[PDB]
Symmetry: D2
């Protein structure tokens, strides 16, 4: 008996003698007949968008579908574009309550290009979803023969088939000849150990990201404050620092109850609480190792529970 | 005889500026150091005014010294290094240096960094390489150098093309030099400018608001740099507002939030259809430097894209 | 009350108004008076050698001393040269039975040089040895503000103060302002979960390393076989491959009961069992992620339990 | 008209050699490919005889083609690339390529690697850079290129000085070129040699046996490369036996088992007192290439160390 694995597709096909149908995920399965060696695969095309256009409603749709269909399968593989996979994967790492593996996969080369990375990445996502040892590690990304945790994983290069890395705390396991040697699991709470429950949510709190650089304008921060955003994530310089005019808009905003999270445009290392910035004085939250797009994911979900900066900081210390 | 080395400080000391030879006595063995305090700001508050001051200062003082060492906070040091890399016309060593640890803290990195930066500014071999950043025993070009970690002393890396040379026992083995045109091979001349074109940066992510991009278009900004997803792609509502900016007087440069790799021309977005420029390896803060200086010379996106291809 | 931390020194001082004494470790403590903020520190100079001359008898001395003095302290810091720290740290990761933290520290710059990395590295090793959360993670290396596991940790650069990295599975935690956020623990068995017991050993089985390259001579492998070595670790090309003449000497040797372990001169990734080499046919063992110097450490200890290639392979899969 | 490109295979096919244009039809759009099978060996069995054959072949055939692509197994590709980098005197592109995945395996990397290698061999811009290795969309110099992972398609990296250019949509943006002397700027001429000096490699570690080093001294080897601990240091009993070799007719090069960084002269070991040469950034297998070729010209350790300083 092989395990039953569902593939939920969000866009185009990452692999491509069969008749091509109307349905992307049906073509993908025919493209990779070796999947029959390892799994009973059923595909469902949940949505069809470019990853660059990923959004809150696809996240709510995905988490509810995994949580509803948990008992009907032994594991899930999600096909997803590479551009925002690290954001979906963390959203699902916080909101999926299903105890069986959830594995995200993508591809850096077109399925029709020479040396397409899609086929074998899918094969490896299936292996990983089928492995009993994959369970209870949170939501995973499988890319380039490597199992990565949904919180740490990020894209490091604009084109490399090896771009996906857990830049801070390393990967969970490597995949050789259909076998995984797992040597790590994320300590941070995930999945059924988080308080986040998206089951009845129709929308997510509005959270925007502003960038910090030399001579930064305050107009982007001002624009999000004027629209009454619930929160704002600062892509800070070095250890979460802010240009003067940006600092002063987000300081005012935190005083009117905007949640403000200091992250960093620097690609590795933590933005650490009251180091460079008196977070205590301003009502701000330090993101830790979460990059700006990841700190947005957690801040949205934090604002479903609480508006309190001190409560939001303890969430940023435990998830 | 030892080289004459001018230390320009931009903020706090990294070991004030007239005391650095006492603070690092070993400087006395490799150069005649003079110190000037050009400005005093935290690097997180770095601005066009400081850049304009630093370039005019070096360009004017080229004849008075054999080499410059600029002390600078780490947060925006990669921005200032590229601005000077394009605007400096002195072909003596200009070496930027800072410290990841406070001067008064245990195992402070500033003293040896300063020492190594003076070594680099005193080396003949350093001439004609462009503006350099010396951190953690390494010589890096101003175009490719960026900080990779929020706290690590080893943060500064040329993440796409690698370093120019490693420094060992006060000696540099240089094995590389930037091909991109720099200093006196660029047409950017800032001698008479008192302001720089307005260029802002917007972030791409899931469900990104168009409100930042729009805020910059309503302000009449001269340029907008997109920190795109993957290879310079744009969230739908962000793309819509930048497609309108680029037809309306706003040069639009696609860069990436991805910390390594080029945003390539016509690959992910039809740049020709939209009037957009691809940044290549320039991350967004670096793309902002080159876009400001391009817009002192041209608002034509075909000519801005030629500049993005040569510097 | 501050914790009681013992520093065991093996060589010179990594930090240096006090009178300098005869005893290296007494000078080190006076060099770093801030240690009094975090610990009651007692130093013992166990041996005084250069790390390049590290050897089996210092390993047996260190493991027995930690195991004997476990109840007398709350944690151990070992000062050690950088050149072979990654070998000592794994030997001690397999043989220490003490349940309190054991932390190795070193320095890439002379204590007398500008910007000496020693002082603050020692401070951080002490922090890490004093942290209750450090317990049950195996033997650790603390370098450049980073807690690394004794199995994965290796030196990556001949001079960089940041050289120490867990190249395959990432670090265990980062150290900011005297506080560690631990996000990983090694899955591989260590310390009190290994069967290795050095308590009554006077010596270790003889295990040598040979290098593989183009046109490699067999004379180094032959030389270890003639001296009757218990085992030989191959520093293989790519995935553990061997030059012809080296292959043929180690094949013969495994047939006369030499244990042969295929590692790789490649600095990251596993040498994987029957991939490139028919380990089954030759009686050879694949090292996994263990580099040649680390595979030597485990192979020595494997040969205290067993000479059987299949038993040695299961040890290489679990430690 | 398209460039004439000669593919020299050294073993199995990476997509036989006359069929590669059918196996990767898209080659037809960028070059006129001819294929020759020079040798057939696994790269783990690479030897001096193969090296001598490859150098003589390229040097002789320089006038018959516009560019060479050498297909080679990954295990020792960094050794062959540096040997040719020092011995080739053709100043047309010589590009080495291989594959981390079998030709018949899923998502095989060989076809695109081959395609990219031909792009690199066809590019004018590639000339005068030395012998190159193209893997995973990247152009790397033969001196610094090494494999960093036992299985990763992205394994090949210039780990000290970085790549020369990235390949995008069949186009190379070159931003770097090796300063170390290569090809027709080296004095190494292998046209008349039928063997190479005997150089062996020994490993340093805790409690290292002197028996390997001694085995090579008793065989009368011309050279021994130490893979040292840290910055080229030697285990006591290894040091003793190499101190005796260097006074007895055995050139001794200190390198490191550490996968990045230079072994620096006179830093950790008194090289002058002992007759030793420091390898710099050359890892031990690379140091072995340069030591063999140094010993075709000189057994003087002061002159061998000058060679280790220029190539």
């Amino acid at each position: 008996h092989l395990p039953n694995i569902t593939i939920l597709a969000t866009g185009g096909t990452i692999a491509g003698n069969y008749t091509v149908g109307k349905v992307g995920v049906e073509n993908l399965v025919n493209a990779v007949p070796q999947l029959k060696d390892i799994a009973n695969v059923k595909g469902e095309q949940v949505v069809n968008i470019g990853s660059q256009d990923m959004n809150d409603n696809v996240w709510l749709t995905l988490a509810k579908k995994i949580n509803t269909d948990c008992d009907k399968t032994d594991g899930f593989v999600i096909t997803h574009g590479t551009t925002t996979m690290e954001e979906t994967a963390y959203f699902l790492d916080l909101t999926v309550k299903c105890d069986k593996p959830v594995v995200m996969v993508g591809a850096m080369r077109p399925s029709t290009s020479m040396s397409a990375d899609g086929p074998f990445n899918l094969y490896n996502a299936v292996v990983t979803a089928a492995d009993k040892a994959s369970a209870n590690r949170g939501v995973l990304v499988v890319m380039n023969d490597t199992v990565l945790d949904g919180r740490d994983v990020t894209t490091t290069n604009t084109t490399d088939v090896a771009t996906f890395k857990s830049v801070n705390y390393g990967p969970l396991g490597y995949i050789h000849n259909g076998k995984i040697d797992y040597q790590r699991t994320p300590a941070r709470k995930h999945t059924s150990d988080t308080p986040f429950d998206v089951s009845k949510l129709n929308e997510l709190p509005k959270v925007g990201i502003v960038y910090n650089y030399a001579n930064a304008s305050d107009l982007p921060a001002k624009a999000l404050v004027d629209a009454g955003y619930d929160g704002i994530v600062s892509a800070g310089v070095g250890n979460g620092n802010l240009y003067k005019s940006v600092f002063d808009t987000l300081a005012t905003a935190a005083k009117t109850g905007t949640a403000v999270v200091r992250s960093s445009r620097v690609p590795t290392g933590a933005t650490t609480q009251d180091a460079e910035v008196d977070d205590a004085k301003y009502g701000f939250v330090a993101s830790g190792t979460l990059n700006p797009q990841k700190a947005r994911v957690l801040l949205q979900l934090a604002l479903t529970q609480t508006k309190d900066p001190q409560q939001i900081q303890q969430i940023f210390n435990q998830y």
